[PDB]
Amino acid sequence: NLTLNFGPQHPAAHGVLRLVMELSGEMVRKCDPHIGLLHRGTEKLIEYKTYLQALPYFDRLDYVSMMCNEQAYSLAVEKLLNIQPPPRAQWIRVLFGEITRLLNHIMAVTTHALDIGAMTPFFWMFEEREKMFEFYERVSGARMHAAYVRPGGVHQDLPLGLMDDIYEFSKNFSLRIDELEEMLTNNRIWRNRTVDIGIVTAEDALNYGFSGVMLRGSGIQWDLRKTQPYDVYDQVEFDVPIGSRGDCYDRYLCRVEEMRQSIRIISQCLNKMPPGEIKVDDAKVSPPKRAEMKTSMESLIHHFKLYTEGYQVPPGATYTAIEAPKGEFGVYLVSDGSSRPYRCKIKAPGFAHLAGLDKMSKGHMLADVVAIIGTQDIVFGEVDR
Amino acid sequence: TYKYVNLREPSMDMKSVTDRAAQTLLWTELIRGLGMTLSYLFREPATINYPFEKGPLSPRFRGEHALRRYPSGEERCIACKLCEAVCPAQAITIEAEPRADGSRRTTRYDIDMTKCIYCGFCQEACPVDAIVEGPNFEFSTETHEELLYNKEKLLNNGDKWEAEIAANIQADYLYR
Amino acid sequence: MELLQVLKRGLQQVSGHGGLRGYLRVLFRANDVRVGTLVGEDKYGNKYY
Amino acid sequence: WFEVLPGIAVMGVCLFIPGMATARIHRFSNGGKEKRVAHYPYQWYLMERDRRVSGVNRSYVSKGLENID
Amino acid sequence: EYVVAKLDDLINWARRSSLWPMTFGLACCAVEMMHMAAPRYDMDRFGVVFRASPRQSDVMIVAGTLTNKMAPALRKVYDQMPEPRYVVSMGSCANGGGYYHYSYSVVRGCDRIVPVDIYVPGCPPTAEALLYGILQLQKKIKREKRLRIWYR
Amino acid sequence: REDRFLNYFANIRWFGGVPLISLGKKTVKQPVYIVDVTKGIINAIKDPDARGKTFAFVGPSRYLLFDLVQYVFAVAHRIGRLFEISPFEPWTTRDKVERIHTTDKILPHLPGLEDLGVEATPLELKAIEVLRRHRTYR
Amino acid sequence: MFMINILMLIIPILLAVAFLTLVERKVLGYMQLRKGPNVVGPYGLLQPIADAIKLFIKEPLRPATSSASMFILAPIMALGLALTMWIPLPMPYPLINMNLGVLFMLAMSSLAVYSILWSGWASNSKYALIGALRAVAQTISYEVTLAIILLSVLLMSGSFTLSTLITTQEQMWLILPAWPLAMMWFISTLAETNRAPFDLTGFNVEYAAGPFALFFMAEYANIIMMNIFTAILFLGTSHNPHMPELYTINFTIKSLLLTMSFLWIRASYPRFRYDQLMHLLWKNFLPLTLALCMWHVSLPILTSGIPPQ
Amino acid sequence: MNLMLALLTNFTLATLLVIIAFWLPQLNVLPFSMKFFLVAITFLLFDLEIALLLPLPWASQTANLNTMLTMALFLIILLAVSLAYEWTQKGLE
Ligand SMILES: CCCCCCCCCCCCCCCCCC(=O)OC[C@H](COP(=O)(O)OCCN)OC(=O)CCCCCCCCCCCCCCCCC
Ligand code: SF4
Ligand code: SF4
Ligand code: SF4
């Protein structure tokens, strides 16, 4: 049998993920991919840093999420430190935490529609995506990778503006999602390109430990978005999509309705924000203000020491996970009792979502296999967990 | 809650099949839809002519390093080493010494612009507000041997401009 | 018959600024051909339109 | 939308040449006359005959009524 | 000679007028180059076409972070390029490997393997200084082919 | 790898492979291997006391034969030039053809390589590497 | 001066498609909200003349794993027959008055599949050995879908020659009796010439800067040829004897619009995933082709409208 | 007499250009699969019986027509019945 390794080929998509194919003439029936192109030494590296200093290495763990990562870290630290965050701060973590889902669910369709080979829905949506990075630069520090969420809540307040901008932005977005509905849904060939492909629906679709979509849209109703709270996140109203059967085209149609939920939540979140503060007030965790660290005596000693070493975290293990826009996000943060943490093991999606490519692939073509991968939305560097 | 999408049984009668038969046979689909949504070509191309035109920014945008000083030159740096201890890449290296006047200053001052991961915490750690991430992306030399910035780049680089820097701090220091 | 109603707008827009030398000199760098209305002052000869 | 119009007027003009060229050759080679076509062997027999009696050796010239009076 | 040296103002102009780059998407510096492909700062048709097969390349671009499991695969593709080539690496993790720099399994530099000509700094260089690096590269081509065999 | 003398052979895909010049008299000289050349310099660069005492480079074992030209076609199984091509980088039908066929195994009283040790390389092991022709497997 | 008619057709048709890769992108440009070539042209029109210089500067390294007599043999025939097929084509006067030429176009286009079988096979392994086979295997299926419905309009036009085809369409625009055939003409011709919906199309990746340009220059030569071939057949133009110039004015300008269609369909659609791609021919196309083949026989009989010849 | 002097320029132009392409401006100084066989045999069967179908437009300017009518339709029948038994087994094609 021919043993071609169609992978390292820089054939668009993402020139990585080099695997083997022991194809039985035309059908595959055996797929054993290799990973480890970026191992980077991540989990060993954090063992020498402090809590505030290690924080951007959670940010660079995806390619896409900037505020959904570091959402799974501060909320994994504030439980250890007996802190609730202040109420103005929680309305921003839901706002940017429900704006990164309008970055994955744009990239999760276009990049899938580029491996397939369509050109024009790649350029028709990233030109609208530019209207959104101006937000990131205006609020935090940079284009994408922002050390913005801290353990002491939000870093700083978003400036004057950004409320007649987001309302200006979000009132003209549903026309753009009505474009791709005409581009892909009512079309037949793309429907014929993906129906009854990847029919994985049994209880081994959950014994493989999958997280969301490539879940509930295939069947079993469950999510971490209204059975487990984060912040002020249950006080808004929305629904969660479910597809019919257990193929890719009934996990594709989650993502059209999923983007039709984030517009509602943003248009529901803006009406409910109170004026208030930014940081936690007790200042053993938050740094004091700049106009304060130049006047009093108490401000500097709880400033100058708070950057030489970090916080004082109590011992005892902990664990949590939140909704990453492609899955769960496990962090088993072992604390020791000093400024420097102990072991920090992460669970990212793709461990389950790509080990189950063995079950999902066989009985099918070779041209099916590239169409499988862009449905799970697998990003490397994120499989470094 | 719920929603059952793509869950709809067909019509299956005499007349509505003629809407599904004219679709496949004469292609009232795929042209009314996909030949019109492409054209849609008459819109204006939103392209920036980069060597002439430039895009928007923010007043808190990061970039090139620089050092400031007081009115008539004083070296605002006090070498309190705090930017070093929070640099995640340890791109800072400072050796200090008592200068003969008596007040302490610096001797070596380094920013590994290769290693520099731009966490910008140096801008938010100096008490006397010395180092500033200056907003100019002018870069791209030709050797690895050049981007290691010594001190006499940085005071010079902090003095190619100041009115660019001094207006952005003065429009943003109330927030932080 | 719209090949002349917007052409009258474009005729002064092309011809009525600099003539033939001021058009062809600025032509040979890019398609940046529409002349700016308001001008800046600074500094050398780089009038920021 | 404007810049594509000089793109059309290059390759499309590049097809205007051979239709112009060939119709200015066979018209020129027969002196403002079209070329006598021959698809059937009875049709060729006229040209095989009339070239021998045209004036010397040509198929694109005629005699007329005034030849034999 | 004025006759012969006039010729390389076409040929050394023609190679800096049509560059067909390869991109190695490995890490977060890949994503920002896609926004350069997105038509705001439209990368196409300013001299340079989009993606292309690995055979027909002139300017290879390493972006992101190199691991020791990719150090053989980089050199093999680097051999298959034709002769007038150039290497330009964006991203601060291609100039010393950013941080991750003290890790046990990251290639220190992306310079101890391939010879690279233009160094753009930064976690993501913002697709704003990177067109500036490319216009630096066409500015670097002021070289000559005549008055090389005409001298020696 | 990329010298001129050994690559003068097997770049002779031609309508006749003639040796120099259809005779097995003087062939060959002493082909020292290139690792021994770069190793001799680095030992001498702080030797010490190696000034004036000029040195000679021993070749392989021992003189060499005519078999070398037959050894080429047996196992091979029969940089700033210009923009298109250099007009004259020829095979040079001049005194090039005789500068190699003039062997001159010279005086062995020079010390000159084994004392600047250690350099010992055969020919039969390094010959697979430099030669590269159409079979490439068998 | 028959020779100067030759050079004023071969040379002025190379610039007809060498200045089309420009037009390929700009039409692609102004769909995506982006402009054409901006810095070199100024209107783009100085771009491909420089890029044509590069592929003959850049070094064509040869495979040591292949023969040489076979490897350059496929670009020999690539400009050979794909330019020879231009010859008996009227505008309004063809270079050669062939007594039968519609068979002659199919006779030359059937050797187009005989070139791709060379370059993949004589070169290398796997990709170039198995991957280059299937592309013949799809393009052998599109002569039977091509030639049959071709024959169904010769029953009504009258004969084999192309000079009578202009006179018989002087009032018609013959798409109107054959608008079912118009789809299966244009779909099948799109599929043979290896374009974006009907693509699976190692037979290019081994070619360096030298002979890749040929099998990029010959492939483009095909695509305006299937435009100009559909042009004289379906959308026939008016003819004036006293004014031959007015023919060619409204001749190429109609073929130039259909030339845009290959650029226009490319900006909409995905691929077809090879197992479907032949399955949509035999199961789906071919039974309708036989039915309409029976249709154009009985109806000129049951009209007493047999075309004269 | 130029047919034959018509293509001789075309083929000498292609073999010229490769010498400036592959030559002198360079100077560097199978497993069997059954399902990918039966379609070639199936094609050649329908390739023959379109050449017998080929002489139709000359077969209309003829004598008594119902001979030429009912017989020319019969070849399409044999071309179609050949489908149906083969339609019972096409394979993964
Ligand atoms: C009684 C009176 C005498 C008889 C008169 C009756 C007149 C009937 C006229 C019929 C002739 C045209 C129909 C020819 C067949 C068309 C091909 C076809 O329909 O295939 C359908 C194709 C296959 O998939 P399908 O079978 O539909 O299964 C999925 C079901 N959901 O599924 C599809 O729908 C996909 C469509 C094919 C994919 C290719 C599309 C590419 C776009 C091509 C654009 C063509 C533009 C127009 C042509 C250019 C003009 C020259
Ligand atoms: S910025 Fe602060 S820590 Fe850094 S050198 Fe200046 S005074 Fe010292
Ligand atoms: S700019 Fe970034 S990497 Fe450099 S010292 Fe400041 S925080 Fe550290
Ligand atoms: S640190 Fe720089 S190179 Fe590394 S992943 Fe982030 S943006 Fe990319």
Swiss-Prot record, chain A:
Reactions catalysed according to its record: a ubiquinone + NADH + 5 H(+)(in) = a ubiquinol + NAD(+) + 4 H(+)(out)
Keyword hit for NAD: yes
Residue list for modification Symmetric dimethylarginine: 40
Post-translational modification, as annotated: Dimethylation at Arg-40 by NDUFAF7 takes place after NDUFS2 assembles into the complex I, leading to stabilize the early intermediate complex.
Entry GO CC: mitochondrial inner membrane; mitochondrion; respiratory chain complex I
Binding-site residues, [4Fe-4S] cluster: 248, 254, 269
Topology with respect to the bilayer: Peripheral membrane protein
Keyword Ribosomal protein attributed: no
This protein's name: NADH dehydrogenase [ubiquinone] iron-sulfur protein 2, mitochondrial
Organism, as annotated: Bos taurus
Parent sequence residues shown: 79 to 463 of 463
Curated annotation (Swiss-Prot), chain C:
Keyword Acetylation: yes
Principal cellular location given in the protein's record: mitochondrion
Modified residues (N-acetylmethionine): 1
UniProt-annotated location(s): Mitochondrion inner membrane
One Gene Ontology cellular component: mitochondrial inner membrane
Keyword annotations of the record: Acetylation, Electron transport, Membrane, Mitochondrion, Mitochondrion inner membrane, Respiratory chain, Transport
Family named by the database record: Belongs to the complex I NDUFA12 subunit family.
Described purpose of this protein according to its UniProt entry: Accessory subunit of the mitochondrial membrane respiratory chain NADH dehydrogenase (Complex I), that is believed not to be involved in catalysis. Complex I functions in the transfer of electrons from NADH to the respiratory chain. The immediate electron acceptor for the enzyme is believed to be ubiquinone.
Record protein name field: NADH dehydrogenase [ubiquinone] 1 alpha subcomplex subunit 12
Designated gene of the protein: NDUFA12
UniProtKB/Swiss-Prot annotation, chain E:
Protein name as catalogued: NADH dehydrogenase [ubiquinone] iron-sulfur protein 7, mitochondrial
Residues of the full protein shown: 64 to 215 of 216
Signal sequence segment: none
Entry-annotated residues carrying Hydroxyarginine: 51
Domain of life: Eukaryota
Modification after translation (UniProt): Hydroxylated ar Arg-51 by NDUFAF5 early in the pathway of assembly of complex I, before the formation of the juncture between peripheral and membrane arms.
Membrane topology, from the record: Peripheral membrane protein
Catalytic function, reaction form: a ubiquinone + NADH + 5 H(+)(in) = a ubiquinol + NAD(+) + 4 H(+)(out)
Cofactor-binding details, from the entry: Binds 1 [4Fe-4S] cluster.
Curated annotation (Swiss-Prot), chain G:
Subcellular location: Mitochondrion inner membrane
Molecular function in Gene Ontology: NADH dehydrogenase (ubiquinone) activity
Predominant localisation class: mitochondrion
EC class: translocase
Swiss-Prot/TrEMBL GO biological process terms: aerobic respiration; mitochondrial respiratory chain complex I assembly
The EC number(s) this enzyme carries: 7.1.1.2
Topology term for the membrane: Multi-pass membrane protein
Superkingdom of origin organism: Eukaryota
Keyword terms: Electron transport, Formylation, Membrane, Mitochondrion, Mitochondrion inner membrane, NAD, Respiratory chain, Translocase, Transmembrane, Transmembrane helix, Transport, Ubiquinone
Keyword Manganese included in the entry's annotation: no
Transmembrane segments: 2-22, 70-90, 100-120, 146-166, 172-192, 214-234, 245-265, 286-306
Mitochondrion is among the record's keywords: yes
Pfam families: NADHdh (PF00146)
One CC-aspect GO term: respiratory chain complex I
PTM-bearing positions, type N-formylmethionine: 1
Matches recorded under PROSITE patterns: COMPLEX1_ND1_1 (PS00667), COMPLEX1_ND1_2 (PS00668)
Entry similarity comment: Belongs to the complex I subunit 1 family.
Subunit and interaction comment: Core subunit of respiratory chain NADH dehydrogenase (Complex I) which is composed of 45 different subunits.
Protein name: NADH-ubiquinone oxidoreductase chain 1
Lineage of the organism: Eukaryota, Metazoa, Chordata, Craniata, Vertebrata
